[PDB]
Amino acid sequence: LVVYEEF
Amino acid sequence: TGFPLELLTRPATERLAYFENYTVAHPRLKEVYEILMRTIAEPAGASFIFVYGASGVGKTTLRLRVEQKLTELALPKLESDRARVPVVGIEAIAPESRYFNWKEYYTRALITLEEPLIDHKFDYGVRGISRDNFGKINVESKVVAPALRRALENALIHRHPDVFFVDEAQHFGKVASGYKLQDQLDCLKSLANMTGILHCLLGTYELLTFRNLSGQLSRRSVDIHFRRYCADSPEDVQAFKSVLLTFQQHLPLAETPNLVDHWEYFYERTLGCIGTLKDWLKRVLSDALDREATTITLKDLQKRALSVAQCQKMFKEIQEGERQLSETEADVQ
Amino acid sequence: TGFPLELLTRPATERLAYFENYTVAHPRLKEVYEILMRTIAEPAGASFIFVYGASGVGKTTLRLRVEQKLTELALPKLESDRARVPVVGIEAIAPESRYFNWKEYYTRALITLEEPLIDHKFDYGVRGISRDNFGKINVESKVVAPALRRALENALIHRHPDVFFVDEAQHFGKVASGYKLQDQLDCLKSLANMTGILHCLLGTYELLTFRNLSGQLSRRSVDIHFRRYCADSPEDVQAFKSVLLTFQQHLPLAETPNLVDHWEYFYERTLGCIGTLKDWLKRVLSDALDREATTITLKDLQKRALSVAQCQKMFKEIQEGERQLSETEADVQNLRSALGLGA
DNA sequence: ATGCATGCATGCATGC
DNA sequence: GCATGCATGCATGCAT
Ligand SMILES: Nc1ncnc2c1ncn2[C@@H]1O[C@H](COP(=O)(O)OP(=O)(O)NP(=O)(O)O)[C@@H](O)[C@H]1O
Ligand SMILES: Nc1ncnc2c1ncn2[C@@H]1O[C@H](COP(=O)(O)OP(=O)(O)NP(=O)(O)O)[C@@H](O)[C@H]1O
Ligand SMILES: [Mg+2]
Ligand SMILES: [Mg+2]
Questions:
Q1: Distance (Å, rounded) from C-alpha B169 to C-alpha B184?
Q2: Rounded distance between C-alpha atoms, residue B181 and residue B179, angstroms
Q3: What residues bind Mg(2+) 2, as annotated (chain C) (predicted)?
Q4: Residue C164 belongs to what H/E stretch?
Q5: How far is the CA of B113 from the CAs of B3, B64, B91, B141, C229, in angstroms?
Q6: How many Å apart are CA C53 and CA C80, to the nearest integer?
Q7: How many angstroms from the chain centroid is the CA of residue C220?
Q8: Do C304 and C283 meet the contact criterion of CB atoms below 8 Å apart?
Q9: Which of C64, C69, C93, C46 is nearest to C199 (CA)?
Q10: For the purposes of burial, counting CB atoms within 10 Å of the CB of B220, is it exposed (0-12), middle (13-18) or buried (19 or more)?
Q11: What is the 8-class DSSP label of residue C138?
Q12: Contact yes or no for B37/B49 (Cβ under 8 A)
């Protein structure tokens, strides 16, 4: 469960 | 970090726009993006880049992000030479007639490549095609196809774009005759070789049959499979759950809804596609904002979910495409 | 004699290019080349030349070699006879097509005589085919087949090439469901007859269907068998060993293995075909250069060797082709008895 | 005055 | 029989 930086 | 807490006092339109603008860089998208950029940076003798995937994974979003980053990279080099055009991208047009119309595609490619500094290449060897009385390019109707194709080649070699994007390239497969299908792709290949510009084709699994009519096409091109997330492998399930958690934390609502525990339903409707999930969540958030609700319930998901028949058809199509892409070439190297 | 040592100071691309350009004139290739050159020197009322060899035997390389030889020989006369063009070679179907399109064939043949000084001709006799004083010859797509055929006939008669080459002519049998093999050969014979230009047909053993279908074409045709090397004949084995040793000596690497002793393995994975073995060695050298290694191991040969199934299929195909082409004294006696006064 | 360029009318060529 | 798109030839308006 890792937060993802905006693409 | 989640969505900014200040947006709760903002009107519903601002929150919806913020959610729409927000993007997620899930590992498959990141991998495809890096592969596409590395392929763009060096042609390696390949005149075509094929990126095919299931509908709703983010091919259009990938294209848009690639275009933005390439424009950012090319701006310092655009400072010196204003004539050079960094990137040209245009969706393929589905023809109303059985035969694909290459004339309209060429005209629209010329229109897409239109540059406000028209004085650089105001004459392509045309019959009045150049813009007049208005900013947009006015293409003469009576211009024959070979001459306008020559004009397109001249404009392309003058501007020399880094990469040419053709969104929804599966419309190229739409041809009147079965044996005639072999000609459109080789015509586009000849155009690419004459111009020397790297062409990239985006589309669904429908182009897979159009992709591999011969081994020469595979040899002279690069394949990128925008793989979806498959529930068979636990790693993709974990990635899907994490994407759901990120959408939960970034959705502008007073109370964050526990979307993680309903991951099975989301995979049932989204079929592992991030874009469909984003569209569904945007619809649900729109209903929540219009009702001025504070939390998302399973009824909200069910109301705007895709129908079971639509999901069945989509799963059948994507499974058939994956099985057809499981073709193997086991032979002498 | 071995490759020059200066190649080792060059990167992989130059070494692989040198290996690719290297050629071996094995005795069978020399004999077939001499026979073909002498046949070109005197067609003697023959419109077809059928040269059939197995895949990767050297038919294409023979074609380029003979084309260059006729060009060099005709150049001293071509200084004054600048209008003439000694050789012209085209493929049957250059981009694969499920069918052979005559019109495409004539268009390719007509465009494959272009020269920057197009003033030698001034005319083909057909509208929509002349070029605007350019090296690129344009053919209108709406021109009917017979008219541009007439243009091609006029061009062939005026230019007067020594021989027309049709490489990979096995594609001639790829008819568009017409099933008119004899009609196709009749059309080619008629073209050769009104043009007076010798036609050479190059292809695999598939074109044996073209061989003896009719008596007229049988007389008009000259048969040349590009025989492969077979382990049954000791001299063929010796020639194969010589080719292996020459390729071992001429491959640009610091050291080379004793691949001559592995001649059984090479013959098993190449069926005594020079072109196939050269392609295999080229792949091995490409792998070595990718590794930037200074030696060739047995695993290097085994990695990019021919598959067992492919070897099994081609062995049967070639044996059937050779049996079809085989001749016996029994046939001679049968024919003599049919004619009369058998003995 | 006249030559050039473009717009329009008509044939045509294929398809339905 | 009709449709529909494209190519060509002729008429005419404009500029030198
Ligand atoms: N990885 C992503 N992260 C965040 N939003 C996304 C992502 N992928 C898609 N979206 C959003 O969802 C929308 C629809 O996805 P899109 O990129 O159009 O899918 P697609 O697979 O390209 N569809 P199509 O090519 O028409 O079958 C996008 O325009 C974005 O707004
Ligand atoms: N005499 C030769 N010396 C060195 N290499 C050779 C020679 N002949 C053929 N080769 C190599 O083998 C390759 C294939 O030869 P080619 O002349 O195409 O054989 P083929 O029997 O005509 N094959 P196909 O394409 O099935 O008709 C060449 O491009 C060379 O790499
Ligand atoms: Mg899309
Ligand atoms: Mg060959």
A1: 12
A2: 5
A3: 60, 167
A4: strand C163-167
A5: 37, 16, 13, 19, 59
A6: 38
A7: 20
A8: yes
A9: C46
A10: middle
A11: P
A12: no
CB C248 within 8 A of CB C264: no
CA B140 / C1′ D6 distance in Å:
12
Nearest to B86 by CA among B195, B9, B163: B163
Is B333 an 8 Å CB contact of chain C?
yes
Q: How far apart are CA B90 and CA B172, in angstroms?
A: 13
State the amino acid at position B37 in one-letter form: M
Q: What is the rounded distance in angstroms from the CA atom of residue C260 to the CA atom of residue C208?
A: 34
Q: Which residues, at least 6 apart from C36, have a Cβ–Cβ distance to it below 8 Å? A: C49, C51, C62, C66, C200, C224
Q: With the CA atoms of C204, C209, C212 and C217 taken in that order, what torsion angle do they form, in degrees rounded to the nearest 10? A: -90
In the structure, which protein residues have their CB atom closer than 6 angstroms to any atom of ligand 1? A 7; B 23-24, 26, 29, 55-61, 204, 274-275, 278-279
The strand pair at B221-226 and C163-167 is best described as unpaired
Closest CA to B274 of C241, C57, C120, A4: A4
Report the alpha-carbon angle C74-C75-C76, nearest 5.
95
Q: Do C97 and B333 touch (CB under 8 A)?
A: no
Task: Give residue B182's identity as a one-letter amino acid code.
Answer: Q
3-state secondary structure chain B: CCCCHHHHHCCHHHHHHHHHHCCCCCHHHHHHHHHHHHHHHCCCCCCEEEEEECCCCCHHHHHHHHHHHHHHHHHHHHHHCCCCCCEEEEECCCCCCCCCCHHHHHHHHHHHCCCCCHHHCCCCCCCCCCCCCCCCCCCCCCCCHHHHHHHHHHHHHHHCCCEEEEECHHHHHCCCCCCCHHHHHHHHHHHHHHHCCEEEEEECCCHHHHHCCCHHHHHCEEEEEECCCCCCCHHHHHHHHHHHHHHHHHCCCCCCCCCCCCHHHHHHHHCCCHHHHHHHHHHHHHHHHHCCCCCCCHHHHHHHCCCHHHHHHHHHHHHHHHHHHCCCCCCCC
Question: How many CA atoms does the CB half-sphere of B215 hold within 13 Å?
Answer: 4
User: Residue with structure tokens 């969540």?
Assistant: B281
Q: Which residue has the tokens 């000596």?
A: C249
Residue B88 in contact with residue B113, Cβ under 8 Å? Answer: yes
Nearest neighbour of B29 by CB, restricted to A1, A2, A7: A7
Number of Cβ within 10 Å of residue C99's Cβ equals 14
Asked if residue B125 keeps its beta carbon closer than 7 A to nucleic acid strand D, the reply is no
Please name the residue that has the structure tokens 């005209």. B107
Q: Which residues are near ligand 2 (CB < 6 Å)?
A: C 23-24, 29, 53, 55-61, 168, 204, 274-275, 278-279
Residues whose CB is less than 8 angstroms from the CB of residue C301 and which lie 6 or more positions away in sequence, other chains included: C259, C262, C265, C280, C284
Q: What DSSP line would sit under C263-310, residue for residue?
A: HHHHHHHHTT-HHHHHHHHHHHHHHHHHHT-SS--HHHHHHTPPPHHH
Ligand 1 pocket test target in B26, B50, B60, B166 with most atoms within 8 Å of CB: B60
CB B85 within 8 A of CB B64: no
Q: Method used for this model?
A: cryo-EM
Is residue B273 within 8 A of residue B60, CB to CB? The reply is no
* Radius of gyration of chain C from its Cα atoms, rounded to whole angstroms: 23
